[PDB]
Design a protein around this motif. Structure first.
Motif, PDB file in Angstrom:
ATOM      1  N   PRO A 160      41.940  52.310  29.329  1.00  0.00           N
ATOM      2  CA  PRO A 160      40.614  52.040  29.901  1.00  0.00           C
ATOM      3  C   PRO A 160      40.393  50.551  30.134  1.00  0.00           C
ATOM      4  CG  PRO A 160      40.449  53.692  28.188  1.00  0.00           C
ATOM      5  CD  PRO A 160      41.857  53.156  28.128  1.00  0.00           C
ATOM      6  N   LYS A 161      39.858  50.224  31.309  1.00  0.00           N
ATOM      7  CA  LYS A 161      39.489  48.856  31.656  1.00  0.00           C
ATOM      8  C   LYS A 161      38.026  48.636  31.312  1.00  0.00           C
ATOM      9  CE  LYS A 161      43.287  48.421  32.449  1.00  0.00           C
ATOM     10  NZ  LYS A 161      44.124  47.421  31.739  1.00  0.00           N
ATOM     11  N   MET A 162      37.737  47.556  30.594  1.00  0.00           N
ATOM     12  CA  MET A 162      36.414  47.340  30.016  1.00  0.00           C
ATOM     13  C   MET A 162      35.655  46.382  30.926  1.00  0.00           C
ATOM     14  SD  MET A 162      36.495  49.362  27.561  1.00  0.00           S
ATOM     15  CE  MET A 162      34.887  48.987  26.858  1.00  0.00           C
ATOM     16  N   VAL A 163      34.643  46.897  31.623  1.00  0.00           N
ATOM     17  CA  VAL A 163      33.832  46.103  32.533  1.00  0.00           C
ATOM     18  C   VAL A 163      32.367  46.434  32.279  1.00  0.00           C
ATOM     19  CG1 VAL A 163      35.541  45.671  34.372  1.00  0.00           C
ATOM     20  CG2 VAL A 163      34.240  47.832  34.334  1.00  0.00           C
ATOM     21  N   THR A 164      31.479  45.626  32.869  1.00  0.00           N
ATOM     22  CA  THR A 164      30.041  45.825  32.715  1.00  0.00           C
ATOM     23  C   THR A 164      29.431  46.598  33.872  1.00  0.00           C
ATOM     24  OG1 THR A 164      29.415  43.747  33.791  1.00  0.00           O
ATOM     25  CG2 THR A 164      29.887  43.664  31.451  1.00  0.00           C
ATOM     26  N   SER A 165      30.229  47.398  34.572  1.00  0.00           N
ATOM     27  CA  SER A 165      29.721  48.226  35.653  1.00  0.00           C
ATOM     28  C   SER A 165      28.569  49.095  35.136  1.00  0.00           C
ATOM     29  CB  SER A 165      30.877  49.071  36.209  1.00  0.00           C
ATOM     30  OG  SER A 165      30.473  50.074  37.107  1.00  0.00           O
ATOM     31  N   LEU A 166      27.576  49.335  36.007  1.00  0.00           N
ATOM     32  CA  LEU A 166      26.272  49.882  35.612  1.00  0.00           C
ATOM     33  C   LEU A 166      26.395  51.139  34.765  1.00  0.00           C
ATOM     34  CD1 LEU A 166      23.148  50.077  35.808  1.00  0.00           C
ATOM     35  CD2 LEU A 166      23.487  51.387  37.910  1.00  0.00           C
ATOM     36  N   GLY A 167      25.795  51.106  33.574  1.00  0.00           N
ATOM     37  CA  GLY A 167      25.838  52.240  32.669  1.00  0.00           C
ATOM     38  C   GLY A 167      27.012  52.240  31.717  1.00  0.00           C
ATOM     39  N   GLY A 225      40.864  38.707  34.257  1.00  0.00           N
ATOM     40  CA  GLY A 225      40.205  39.072  33.022  1.00  0.00           C
ATOM     41  C   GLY A 225      38.702  38.923  33.042  1.00  0.00           C
ATOM     42  N   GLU A 226      38.102  38.883  34.230  1.00  0.00           N
ATOM     43  CA  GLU A 226      36.654  38.955  34.378  1.00  0.00           C
ATOM     44  C   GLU A 226      36.164  40.350  34.007  1.00  0.00           C
ATOM     45  OE1 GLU A 226      34.381  36.502  35.036  1.00  0.00           O
ATOM     46  OE2 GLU A 226      33.135  38.227  34.466  1.00  0.00           O
ATOM     47  N   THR A 227      35.179  40.436  33.106  1.00  0.00           N
ATOM     48  CA  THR A 227      34.635  41.738  32.729  1.00  0.00           C
ATOM     49  C   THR A 227      33.285  42.035  33.369  1.00  0.00           C
ATOM     50  OG1 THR A 227      33.659  40.825  30.684  1.00  0.00           O
ATOM     51  CG2 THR A 227      35.865  41.797  30.501  1.00  0.00           C
ATOM     52  N   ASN A 228      32.623  41.043  33.958  1.00  0.00           N
ATOM     53  CA  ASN A 228      31.277  41.236  34.489  1.00  0.00           C
ATOM     54  C   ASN A 228      31.398  41.560  35.974  1.00  0.00           C
ATOM     55  OD1 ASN A 228      28.474  41.378  34.409  1.00  0.00           O
ATOM     56  ND2 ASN A 228      28.220  39.182  34.821  1.00  0.00           N
ATOM     57  N   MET A 229      31.682  42.830  36.261  1.00  0.00           N
ATOM     58  CA  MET A 229      31.889  43.258  37.638  1.00  0.00           C
ATOM     59  C   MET A 229      31.586  44.742  37.752  1.00  0.00           C
ATOM     60  SD  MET A 229      36.067  43.385  37.650  1.00  0.00           S
ATOM     61  CE  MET A 229      36.386  44.625  38.905  1.00  0.00           C
ATOM     62  N   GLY A 230      31.023  45.132  38.891  1.00  0.00           N
ATOM     63  CA  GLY A 230      30.825  46.530  39.224  1.00  0.00           C
ATOM     64  C   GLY A 230      31.838  47.108  40.196  1.00  0.00           C
ATOM     65  N   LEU A 231      32.774  46.304  40.702  1.00  0.00           N
ATOM     66  CA  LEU A 231      33.794  46.851  41.590  1.00  0.00           C
ATOM     67  C   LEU A 231      34.623  47.892  40.837  1.00  0.00           C
ATOM     68  CD1 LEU A 231      34.961  43.576  43.468  1.00  0.00           C
ATOM     69  CD2 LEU A 231      33.817  45.560  44.489  1.00  0.00           C
ATOM     70  N   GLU A 284      39.773  48.520  50.151  1.00  0.00           N
ATOM     71  CA  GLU A 284      40.255  47.145  50.070  1.00  0.00           C
ATOM     72  C   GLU A 284      39.973  46.618  48.671  1.00  0.00           C
ATOM     73  OE1 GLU A 284      41.894  44.502  52.242  1.00  0.00           O
ATOM     74  OE2 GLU A 284      41.987  44.328  50.059  1.00  0.00           O
ATOM     75  N   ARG A 285      41.019  46.458  47.858  1.00  0.00           N
ATOM     76  CA  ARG A 285      40.864  46.101  46.456  1.00  0.00           C
ATOM     77  C   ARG A 285      41.166  44.631  46.174  1.00  0.00           C
ATOM     78  NH1 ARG A 285      39.578  48.975  42.962  1.00  0.00           N
ATOM     79  NH2 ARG A 285      40.797  47.985  41.294  1.00  0.00           N
ATOM     80  N   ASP A 286      41.146  43.765  47.194  1.00  0.00           N
ATOM     81  CA  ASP A 286      41.585  42.387  46.964  1.00  0.00           C
ATOM     82  C   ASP A 286      40.720  41.686  45.911  1.00  0.00           C
ATOM     83  OD1 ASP A 286      39.384  42.375  48.698  1.00  0.00           O
ATOM     84  OD2 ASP A 286      40.209  40.790  49.983  1.00  0.00           O
ATOM     85  N   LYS A 287      39.392  41.767  46.043  1.00  0.00           N
ATOM     86  CA  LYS A 287      38.524  41.107  45.071  1.00  0.00           C
ATOM     87  C   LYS A 287      38.578  41.800  43.713  1.00  0.00           C
ATOM     88  CE  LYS A 287      36.616  37.763  43.989  1.00  0.00           C
ATOM     89  NZ  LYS A 287      36.892  36.355  44.432  1.00  0.00           N
ATOM     90  N   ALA A 288      38.553  43.133  43.700  1.00  0.00           N
ATOM     91  CA  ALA A 288      38.652  43.869  42.440  1.00  0.00           C
ATOM     92  C   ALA A 288      39.927  43.511  41.688  1.00  0.00           C
ATOM     93  CB  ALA A 288      38.595  45.372  42.708  1.00  0.00           C
TER      94      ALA A 288
END
Ligand SMILES: Nc1nc2c(ncn2[C@@H]2O[C@H](COP(=O)(O)OP(=O)(O)OP(=O)(O)O)[C@@H](O)[C@H]2O)c(=O)[nH]1
Ligand SMILES: C[S@@+](CC[C@H](N)C(=O)[O-])C[C@H]1O[C@@H](n2cnc3c(N)ncnc32)[C@H](O)[C@@H]1O
Ligand SMILES: [Mn+2]
Length: 259
Positions: free
Chosen positions: A108-115, A42-48, A31-35
């Protein structure tokens, strides 16, 4: 003609309604609704997960089917779903991710996912133009579906050859790669020779749509290749007519932060 070749042909002879009914029947689907909403905002602070590829690699890792460790290379990283997953894993020290698309949906999508800080993204790169360098884990998710089974088979052989080149450079590297058309005899022969040099085996993830015969090869598993393929072609053929829908499951959330 193999079982998989007939699967390809029956798929091609579906009407459009039949194709849409068939492609997701009985598969797991995150379920990718929130992602999707955060990505489109354009939110980058996400781990989804930035893509549906993340759950496929997570499934292989959580089953114990892959070793993700050390210096990781992501060949054909697309949006980066495998790169982000790998960079979240304890035994992983860095990710070098390469992909051809420079902008758009497949960059590439730029997010702050862990690591995320352990990842070096190189867009605009054709990985077949690249000389292999040192890697402890080599991953490759390349292989574009095609209505022509022979074209699927050749695309798959090109990925196996690429993996041979990285394995010649790094003989003890762990490998995980997409095998787009494992039903083709020419692919089975190339993959069996890979298996006899380096070990490994073939698995189907439950997130793969029925509209693709893709399976994933990993050096960390074992099993007869022809038997694994036959089991999956039979299942794909059986699912024609199956009316059960997709099974919705939660999307991966790796959390956020540096490592
Ligand atoms: N009968 C039929 N077969 C199709 C159609 N579109 C694609 N296919 C077949 O199904 C294969 C899957 O192509 P994809 O578009 O990657 O499948 P998908 O599950 O829809 O995934 P997305 O491309 O992300 O939308 C193609 O290689 C064709 O063989 C169609 O409209 N009708
Ligand atoms: C199926 S996607 C991989 C998705 C990724 N595993 C994820 O989880 O998001 C494969 C990617 O490889 C890229 N690709 C195909 N051929 C390539 C090549 N020769 N060099 C670099 N990238 C390539 C495609 O643009 C595509 O974005
Ligand atoms: Mn489509």
């Amino acid at each position: 003609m193999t079982l998989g070749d007939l699967w390809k042909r029956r798929l091609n002879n579906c009407t459009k309604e039949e194709f849409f009914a068939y492609r997701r029947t009985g598969i797991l689907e995150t379920e990718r609704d929130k992602a999707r909403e955060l990505l489109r905002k354009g939110e980058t602070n996400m781990g989804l997960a930035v893509s549906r590829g993340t759950a496929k690699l997570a499934w292989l890792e959580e089953r114990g089917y892959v070793n993700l460790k050390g210096e990781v290379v992501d060949l054909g990283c697309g949006r980066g779903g495998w790169s982000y997953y790998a960079a979240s894993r304890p035994a992983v020290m860095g990710v070098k991710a390469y992909t051809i698309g420079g902008k758009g949906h497949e960059a590439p999508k730029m997010v702050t996912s862990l690591g995320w800080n352990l990842i070096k993204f190189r867009a605009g790169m054709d990985v077949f133009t690249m000389q292999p360098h040192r890697a402890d884990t080599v991953m490759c998710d390349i292989g574009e579906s095609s209505p022509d089974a022979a074209i699927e088979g050749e695309r798959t052989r090109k990925v196996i050859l690429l993996m041979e080149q990285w394995k010649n450079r790094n003989p003890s590297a762990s490998c995980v790669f997409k095998v787009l058309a494992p039903y083709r005899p020419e692919v089975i022969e190339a993959l069996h020779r890979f298996q006899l040099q380096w070990g490994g085996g073939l698995v189907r993830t439950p997130f793969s749509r029925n509209s693709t015969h893709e399976m994933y090869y990993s050096t960390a598993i074992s099993g007869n290749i022809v038997n694994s393929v036959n089991v999956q072609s039979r299942k794909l053929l059986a699912r024609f007519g199956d009316q059960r829908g997709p099974i919705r499951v939660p999307e991966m959330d790796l959390g956020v932060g540096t490592r």
